[PDB]
Write a protein that binds this ligand. Structure first.
Ligand SMILES: CCNC(=O)N1CCN(c2nc(NC3CCN(C(=O)[C@@H](CCc4ccc(OC)cc4)NC(=O)[C@@H]4CCCCN4C(=O)C(=O)C(C)(C)CC)CC3)nc(N(Cc3cnn(C)c3)C3CC3)n2)CC1
Ligand SMILES: CCNC(=O)N1CCN(c2nc(NC3CCN(C(=O)[C@@H](CCc4ccc(OC)cc4)NC(=O)[C@@H]4CCCCN4C(=O)C(=O)C(C)(C)CC)CC3)nc(N(Cc3cnn(C)c3)C3CC3)n2)CC1
Ligand SMILES: CCNC(=O)N1CCN(c2nc(NC3CCN(C(=O)[C@@H](CCc4ccc(OC)cc4)NC(=O)[C@@H]4CCCCN4C(=O)C(=O)C(C)(C)CC)CC3)nc(N(Cc3cnn(C)c3)C3CC3)n2)CC1
Ligand SMILES: CCNC(=O)N1CCN(c2nc(NC3CCN(C(=O)[C@@H](CCc4ccc(OC)cc4)NC(=O)[C@@H]4CCCCN4C(=O)C(=O)C(C)(C)CC)CC3)nc(N(Cc3cnn(C)c3)C3CC3)n2)CC1
Lengths: 109, 102, 108, 103, 108, 109, 101, 101
């Protein structure tokens, strides 16, 4: 609806953006709209890797991370249509949930 | 006693404000935060002012309320460059608020 | 294409309807130019049909079959997968492309 | 090595040959699969099954089949049907049951 | 999901096959991991089939219908739009996704 | 495939790149591989306008112009798969033709 | 103006009402549509048709219909099937023939 | 000409056709690319490859493919990724192998 909004927390180089078929290396924290945390790669001390263009993540990450450059830290606010929709993720994400992720694009591989 | 117009617009305003969870539109844009704003934007608008107008029964119609909401978004899209969070939110919220208020 | 499916909001991506199951949907049907001709939401009552039972136009039969429970999608359906040359007198003109907003709420 | 340990080692080598990329070789971590430990309550993998054979923990071929099924069932629960992992879990589960069908 | 069409080189974008026309194609078919199972180019002879005549798997029927004359495309076809659970004994395994490189050379 | 290569003839500002939904105003000359001209907006004294993201142009222009910055003049060499493919453009561009465009990005609108 | 000029003037205004954006209002230039004059050999537009009506160049309603058809056929030849121009040309052509049937 | 010389010449003309502007046509000089001989230790180019064919220095197709790869790899080491040169080297390396496989 409001799709995905990208708010910069601290800037990346503003020139190295991920293309289709590249692997993005990120650290993230995911919270519900009211701030309760549901997951964080920082809590596991291990960055998350996914490849753009490979249907691996919710649409708000696909479109939101594609807009960031290496080094950038940003807040992604993602509407349910760009997340888990009516189903949610049983026991983790409720139905019809807007999600907020703190995402840092660490590196491209 | 709230008039029917005062009841409906506050209902609409709360729905519109929920679309701005970070409060980007909550208060008037100052020149200290945005130099030259008052030279560029001639008729500033924000949710807080809209709320004040409802409380003071200044809105004669839903039409006028929609016009202030549009003005607020249009001001944001004039002042801020297209690559900013502010510009993108104003365009998104303008479309989404109109859809909600019909 | 007879029917094109564009996702509006995602379903669970694993529960797809099979032959003989009942699909419970809310829908709005419009002509290609945006004019509404019907909506189950207007009646506050979802529409039900059983897959494999020749109850609906082919664009719904094949389009809803592609959706998973919870999904909301836009179906654009060619006349051959809809009401064809006859149309539906007084409701759908001849040779009409139809657009439905469909939400697959549940299978029964 | 008892008669059962030999047979389970045989089945394990045959099953592992069907996973040339080692998708099932080690426990799935949360770093590689976010929320894995939230969704799958009883993880299983070939490496753990091998350790169980060596420690003579399987009392029957049936118990070994139950861990193999569990491993496949976890993969088909965690991964979406369109993923390489789901398709491999479904293929190997069928192939392993067929191989161990006479138990 | 049933068939995906990715353009390799563009067709004329206006001449699309209709019911009863014969499509003349050169193709290579591979399994998902890239192993080839057949190619008309290896036989120096294009393959012909008539649209609307149930001569081919559904992913070809619907995938080629989406191409225009001259187009070369990669069709990725799910088992439900191909040979499904049975496969094609000795040629296509059960539950196989197929990948074809298809060039629509001409309609007759 | 060789796709499209962008070779700079004279530089643009190297900072203003066209985004999806912007109108590109260009002057161009199009030639076949052997140098024969088939069209030029300069010959008509009127720049060409097209919007990125709207399927208005051959893929080599879609991806090639996206790489230029305002002010840049570049030579685009475009393989047939990124052009008119087997069909060509009857009477103007032969089948299986590699195309060369001299393109200047004048302005974004 | 003769009874024929009047009828064609009526038809032209009614058809032009079907083109509120003025897609058919003036000749298509090569600047807006590269290669147009290479593809379309006999261009036509409402403005040219209006000039023909005023100059009493149409000998029959049939000739007027032929330019209208020519105008639409040019648009469906030049423009790709997914474009607004192609879709409008097909829509307006059917409506104009139906009106002047 | 021996069979190997014929085959390598056939491949070379096909590979050179992929470089119509002649970026790979001649050795990179230090005057044109300062420090090149400090960065690239074993330079290669189509012109040297042609000369190697003519004097019958290639013992196998394998050695010829290795020089083509070296040429592309030298270009991708010397030139920055945002340059026409780097992008061409990556494109031609993939396409030439595809062509000769
Ligand atoms: C077969 C045996 N084996 C096995 O099963 N498994 C396990 C799998 N597995 C695996 N998976 C992935 N990537 C994603 C795939 C999709 N996904 C997700 O979570 C998605 C949600 C599901 C989804 C998918 C597509 C989609 O489209 C529209 C919509 C939804 N989440 C998200 O979009 C967001 C944003 C990003 C972070 C998390 N999000 C969240 O909301 C959350 O916080 C949770 C999920 C906690 C709340 C709900 C799982 C993980 N990569 C790799 N590799 C290769 C490798 C393997 N081993 N090694 C050592 C390397 C590395 C090289 C890449 N391997 C192999 C082992
Ligand atoms: C959506 C509704 N809401 C809204 O619209 N709003 C409120 C939020 N929002 C905003 N903007 C900015 N700062 C920049 C944005 C870009 N810019 C400029 O002036 C630029 C001119 C425009 C420009 C920008 C980039 C560019 O090359 C990339 C080229 C041109 N000028 C200049 O480069 C110079 C240098 C010194 C300043 C003045 N210069 C001058 O020549 C002048 O003197 C003038 C301008 C008079 C002559 C022309 C505005 C200043 N900061 C914050 N915050 C968060 C916060 C804290 N409290 N609150 C309440 C919020 C704090 C954390 C910082 N929020 C936008 C307005
Ligand atoms: C309805 C009556 N009316 C009417 O018919 N018509 C006529 C149409 N028409 C029109 N068309 C276009 N743009 C392209 C559309 C696609 N196209 C092309 O040439 C494409 C080739 C076709 C194509 C399209 C997509 C595709 O992959 C998605 C693959 C192929 N070419 C190219 O990709 C290249 C590179 C760019 C330059 C040219 N190329 C060449 O090879 C050549 O040199 C030629 C073609 C000469 C050799 C063969 C036509 C033109 N814009 C606008 N506007 C609105 C406006 C502003 N003022 N007014 C008054 C209106 C302006 C604001 C923008 N209006 C309205 C009038
Ligand atoms: C594909 C096969 N082919 C190939 O690979 N080739 C052949 C084609 N090609 C090429 N390159 C250049 N120019 C630069 C490209 C960038 N660069 C440099 O050295 C930079 C260091 C790299 C760099 C670049 C940008 C940057 O911030 C944006 C940061 C770093 N150095 C310097 O900034 C300084 C300043 C003075 C000169 C040297 N400096 C030094 O410190 C030194 O002394 C050294 C380097 C020794 C110590 C560090 C190389 C040369 N021109 C042309 N031509 C066409 C032509 C062909 N034949 N003829 C007759 C003409 C014409 C225009 C002349 N062609 C690349 C090689």
């Amino acid at each position: 609806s409001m799709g995905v909004q990208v708010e910069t927390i601290s800037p990346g180089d503003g020139r190295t953006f991920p293309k289709r078929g590249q692997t993005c290396v990120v650290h993230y924290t995911g919270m519900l709209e009211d701030g309760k945390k549901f997951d964080s790669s920082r809590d596991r001390n291990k960055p998350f890797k996914f490849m753009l263009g490979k249907q691996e993540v919710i649409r708000g990450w696909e479109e939101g991370v594609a807009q960031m450059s290496v080094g950038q830290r940003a807040k992604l606010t993602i509407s349910p249509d760009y997340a888990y929709g009516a189903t949610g993720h049983p026991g983790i994400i409720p139905p019809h949930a807007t999600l907020v992720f703190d995402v840092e694009l660490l590196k491209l591989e | 006693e709230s008039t029917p117009i005062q009841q409906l617009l506050e209902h609409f305003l709360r729905q519109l404000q929920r679309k701005d969870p970070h409060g980007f539109f909550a208060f008037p844009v100052t020149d200290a935060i945005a130099p030259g704003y008052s030279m560029i934007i001639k008729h500033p608008m924000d949710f807080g002012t809209m709320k004040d107008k409802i409380v003071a029964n200044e809105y004669k119609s839903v039409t006028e309320f929609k016009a202030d909401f549009k003005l607020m978004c249009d001001n944001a899209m004039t002042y801020n460059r297209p690559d900013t969070v502010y510009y993108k939110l104003a365009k998104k919220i303008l479309h989404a608020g109109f859809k909600m208020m019909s």
